[PDB]
Amino acid sequence: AKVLQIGAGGVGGVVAHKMAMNREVFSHITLASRTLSKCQEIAQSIKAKGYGEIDITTVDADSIEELVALINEVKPQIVLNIALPYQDLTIMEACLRTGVPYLDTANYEHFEYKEQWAFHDRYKEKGVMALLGSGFDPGVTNVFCAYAQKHYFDEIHEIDILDCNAGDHGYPFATNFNPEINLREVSSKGRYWENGEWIETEPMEIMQVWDYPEVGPKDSYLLYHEELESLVRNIKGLKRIRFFMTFGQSYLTHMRCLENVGMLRIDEIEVNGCKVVPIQVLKALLPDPASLASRTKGKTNIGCYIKGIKEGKARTIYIYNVCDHESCYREVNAQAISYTTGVPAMIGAKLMLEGKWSGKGVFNMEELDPDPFMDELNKQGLPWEVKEMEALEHHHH
Amino acid sequence: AKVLQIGAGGVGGVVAHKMAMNREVFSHITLASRTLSKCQEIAQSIKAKGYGEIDITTVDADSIEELVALINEVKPQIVLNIALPYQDLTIMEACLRTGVPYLDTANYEHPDLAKFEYKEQWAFHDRYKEKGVMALLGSGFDPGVTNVFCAYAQKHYFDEIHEIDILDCNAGDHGYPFATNFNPEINLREVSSKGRYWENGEWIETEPMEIMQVWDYPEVGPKDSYLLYHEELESLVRNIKGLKRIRFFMTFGQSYLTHMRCLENVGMLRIDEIEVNGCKVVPIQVLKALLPDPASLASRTKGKTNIGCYIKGIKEGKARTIYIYNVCDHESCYREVNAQAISYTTGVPAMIGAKLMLEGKWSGKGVFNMEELDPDPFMDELNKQGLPWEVKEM
């Protein structure tokens, strides 16, 4: 098949590499990004590791007419949106007009699903499929849930998503993304769902020490996360769902200190005559995020702790995946964060092009059969585990 | 008498003010500097407070000719050097040539090194004595008052002093998450320098900020105190007899140290230029632009400071321990002389040293450190100029 991928960032790289490692499904690969050089750098690594060639081009993903044009010239069977979230809607419109399947790893943001779910009837009518959040979280976390709902429970009551990155880059402080993102995670109020109500919290207000398998105990804080919005819709009998994420104390200290002196401001200021932007100086001071991939060591562990009922008795399982940073860099020239997000995308595409995951309209992961997806994960470098946990019942006569 | 002050920084404004409050001795005041706006700031506060007028003029304290010329024009009876430490030598040469008494509050430091010592200044002794001129070194609180406290205890409370612990605490709060009173480069050297103290005729170094102890400062409470080196240790080991050990400890909040280390880590304290969208940018200059203006802090600082000496020795065959100290309130310092307690505790003492020389209560020919002179008239002026002290029998 001929595929067109948009986006050459860290995740974008892993996706292209993984597609180049499955040439029986992805025969002709076209990679398009705003900056041509990023695309070249990826082709360079793909070629060097012996995975073949890939066509590279650029494009203004903000222009529908341009995207339509590019799609009409390449004639792809599926378009992978591994680009910025603020381009979902324009890429989806292009796909709708050309009648070509769509897949992305993050919802719209100018973040919720409303805008994307809005393309549903138009997609179904055009006879086109659109898959959403095909990453690890959202994505594999969604599949773990649907898979658990299919083979381990009759009813799922509580779901906790636990995301931990123990990776260590060797620097006092260094961010993997654009500082504005890191600030947003710890600045936004936390949100979760219980008994059909969305409950908010103060930023980083709720924390627990969870012992992540193969990693050990870590402080885990409660944050909002996009899959919570589709899981409450799909998992039947759900009473509560929360999302937790790992946060080292050293890291939280640097962020707060930087924010305190205003090193995270976006407005301009006068510095010896010339106008400068606080956060831009930070980006220029912190080490290059690209270079962190070869220095990061340690493991990551993301998964779901699920409590429900099975054959009338309480049950509790823990489905998760552990990934090693150094291994990821050796295989696809990227760290575990990009890796865990990129493989699931390659898989969702593979499934869609093979017909194991077909439909007409816009879909979330939990809506499709997880079995073929779960088999691929064990084969593509993201082996998962199911661990039976303590499930105590209290009878009262 | 006519006096000449060089420099118009925080301490400088305090010195000028206090001098303006003692016209009996300082009847004509001239403030030499390279920053008019700063002098203007000070002159306005002095006038509005009812303490008269002062003459501001400009001069480059790097030029010996300018100084000599300025001094020959003004005919001052004393020159108060409240300028930068690297300028100590040029101002001393000028005073020497014009035969005018000299006084400063910080010892010489070459701009190329971070080493501050008395060597260069002590080397002027014979020329000053021969010329019949007096030079008083480090006339601030520490060094300065701490030295007098020690000379005081040795004259009245001990036959022999064996141990001195100089404790400096600033409990002040400017309300901001983080903010310095000085050029960040300075706050950074304070905590980057090796620690150093003296024991049994020997100098002992430590890793920066290694030794620390919780000390309960009167009117302030228990604070984490760290062992730092300080300039008065160098003269005190010379002048205090029987001394076995001397150490300097300074207070440091945890939040403060956290911000400092964090900032130094991401590179916000670098002085070199980096590129930012094709534009050369000095990190620390961006930091100075984000932090509040040091001048605006004086009016926002609340809280106290406690500086003193913990002394143990022998008095009439028996062991004895005394604690001499001073407590200064930040807000009171702002109301009275338009400055914070850091500036105030260093400034008032410089004024008293000049007062004692101009009245002749402290007279000698050559270069002198505070502990070589009679501390009584100094200790008296302290109770009278806003730095009342207390002696606590341990």
SS (H, E, C) A45-105: HHHHCCCCCCEEECCCCCCHHHHHHHHHHHCCCEEEECCCHHHHHHHHHHHHHHCCCEEEC
What is the number of helices (H) and of strands (E) in chain A?
A: 15, 18
Q: Which chain B positions have a beta carbon within 8 Å of A257's beta carbon?
A: 178, 258-259, 262-263
Q: Which chain A positions have a beta carbon within 8 Å of B266's beta carbon?
A: 172-173, 254, 258, 263, 282, 285-286
Which residues are bridge partners to A131 per DSSP? Answer: A103, A363
CB distance from B69 to chain A under 8 Å?
Answer: no
| b/e code B364-380 from CB counts within 10 Å (16+ = b) | eebbbbbbbbebebbbe
Residues sharing a CB contact under 8 Å with residue B374, sequence separation 6 or more, in sequence order: B155, B361, B362
Compute the distance between CA of residue A206 and CA of residue A247 in angstroms, rounded to an integer: 12
Q: With contact defined as beta carbons under 8 Å apart, do B213 and B249 qualify?
A: yes
Compute the distance between CA of residue B13 and CA of residue B194 in angstroms, rounded to an integer: 31
Compute the distance between CA of residue A92 and CA of residue A76 in angstroms, rounded to an integer: 14
Cα of A335 to nearest chain B Cα, Å: 22
Compute the distance between CA of residue A346 and CA of residue A27 in angstroms, rounded to an integer: 13
Of the candidates B263, B276, B285, the beta carbon closest to that of A284 is on B276
Resolution to one decimal, Å? 2.5
Which tokens in the block code for residue A149? 């709902």
Backbone angles phi, psi at A118, to 5 degrees: -70, -20
Q: Which chain A positions have a beta carbon within 8 Å of B276's beta carbon?
A: 276-277, 280-281, 284
Which tokens in the block code for residue B108? 């010489």
- Flag if B259 and A262 touch (Cβ within 8 Å): no
Cα of A264 to nearest chain B Cα, Å: 11
Compute the distance between CA of residue A359 and CA of residue A370 in angstroms, rounded to an integer: 14
Backbone angles phi, psi at B86, to 5 degrees: -75, -10
CB distance from B271 to chain A under 8 Å?
Answer: no
Which tokens in the block code for residue B194? 């090796």
Of the candidates B178, B262, B290, the beta carbon closest to that of A253 is on B262
**Identity of the amino acid at A363:** F
CB count, 10 Å around CB of A314?
A: 14
Q: With contact defined as beta carbons under 8 Å apart, do A97 and A79 qualify?
A: no
Between strands B389-393 and B318-329, the pairing is: antiparallel
Nearest to A139 by CA among A365, A351, A347, A322: A365
Q: Which residue of B has its CA nearest to A259?
A: B177
- Flag if B290 and A257 touch (Cβ within 8 Å): no
Nearest to A218 by CA among A283, A293, A168: A168
| b/e code B82-94 from CB counts within 10 Å (16+ = b) | bbbbbbbbbbbbb
Backbone angles phi, psi at A218, to 5 degrees: -155, 150
- Flag if A276 and B276 touch (Cβ within 8 Å): yes
**Identity of the amino acid at A237:** G
| b/e code A264-293 from CB counts within 10 Å (16+ = b) | beeeeeebeeeebbbbbbbbbbbbebeebb
Per residue, what are the HEC states of B307-353?
EEEEEEEEECCEEEEEEEEEEEEHHHHHHHHCCCHHHHHHHHHHHHH
SS3 for A316? strand
Torsion, Cα of A83, A84, A87, A89 (10° steps): 90
Instruction: List C-alpha distances in Å: B97 to A228, B60, B67, B131, B144.
Output: 82, 17, 10, 9, 26
CB count, 10 Å around CB of A197?
A: 7
Q: With contact defined as beta carbons under 8 Å apart, do A190 and A271 qualify?
A: no
SS3 for B36? helix
Compute the distance between CA of residue A47 and CA of residue A43 in angstroms, rounded to an integer: 6
Of the candidates A254, A281, A282, the beta carbon closest to that of B262 is on A254
Q: With contact defined as beta carbons under 8 Å apart, do B31 and B56 qualify?
A: yes
After which residues do gaps appear in chain A, with C to N over 2.5 Å?
110
Compute the distance between CA of residue B55 and CA of residue B67 in angstroms, rounded to an integer: 16
Backbone angles phi, psi at B160, to 5 degrees: -150, 135
Compute the distance between CA of residue A389 and CA of residue A377 in angstroms, rounded to an integer: 23
CA within 13 Å, CB half, B184: 26
| b/e code B297-309 from CB counts within 10 Å (16+ = b) | bbebbebbbbbbb
SS3 for A30? strand
Which tokens in the block code for residue A153? 């429970």
Compute the distance between CA of residue B58 and CA of residue B33 in angstroms, rounded to an integer: 5
- Flag if A281 and B279 touch (Cβ within 8 Å): no
**Identity of the amino acid at B57:** T
Of the candidates B177, B265, B277, the beta carbon closest to that of A254 is on B265
Compute the distance between CA of residue A186 and CA of residue A223 in angstroms, rounded to an integer: 8
Question: Which of A279, A281, A286 to probe the B interface (max B CBs under 10 A)?
Answer: A281
- Flag if B266 and A262 touch (Cβ within 8 Å): no
DSSP label at A358? -
Number of residues in chain B:
394
Compute the distance between CA of residue A141 and CA of residue A374 in angstroms, rounded to an integer: 11
Q: Which chain B positions have a beta carbon within 8 Å of A179's beta carbon?
A: none
Nearest to B106 by CA among B33, B186, B32: B186
- Taking one residue from A and the other from B, the number of pairs with CB-CB distance under 8 angstroms is 73
CB count, 10 Å around CB of B315?
A: 16
DSSP label at B292? P
DSSP label at B371? G
CA within 13 Å, CB half, B362: 31
Q: Which residue has the tokens 């228990």?
A: B222
Domains of chain B with bracketed CATH = 1-141+339-393 (3.40.50.720), 142-338 (3.30.360.10)
Q: Which residue of B has its CA nearest to A272?
A: B285
Cα of A105 to nearest chain B Cα, Å: 30
Which contiguous run of DSSP H or E holds residue A242? strand A240-246
Residues sharing a CB contact under 8 Å with residue B360, sequence separation 6 or more, in sequence order: none
Burial class of A330 by CB neighbour count within 10 A (0 to 12, 13 to 18, 19+): exposed
Question: Which of A260, A264, A270, A280 to probe the B interface (max B CBs under 10 A)?
Answer: A260
CB distance from A254 to chain B under 8 Å?
Answer: yes
CA within 13 Å, CB half, B381: 23
Nearest to A238 by CA among A182, A325, A165, A306: A306
CB distance from A264 to chain B under 8 Å?
Answer: no
Backbone angles phi, psi at B50, to 5 degrees: 85, 20
Which contiguous run of DSSP H or E holds residue A44? helix A36-48
Q: Which chain A positions have a beta carbon within 8 Å of B263's beta carbon?
A: 257-258, 261
Compute the distance between CA of residue A331 and CA of residue B330 in angstroms, rounded to an integer: 62
- Flag if A172 and B266 touch (Cβ within 8 Å): yes
Which residues are bridge partners to A336 per DSSP? Answer: none
Q: Which residue of B has its CA nearest to A254?
A: B262
**Identity of the amino acid at B35:** T
Residues sharing a CB contact under 8 Å with residue A319, sequence separation 6 or more, in sequence order: A144, A147, A148, A303, A304, A306, A384, A385, A386, A387
Q: Which chain A positions have a beta carbon within 8 Å of B286's beta carbon?
A: 269, 271, 276, 278, 281
Dihedral-angle region of residue B4 (phi above 0 means left; psi in -120 to 50 means alpha; beta otherwise): beta
Q: Evaluate the omega torsion of the peptide bond into residue A372 and state whether it is cis, within 30 degrees of 0.
A: no
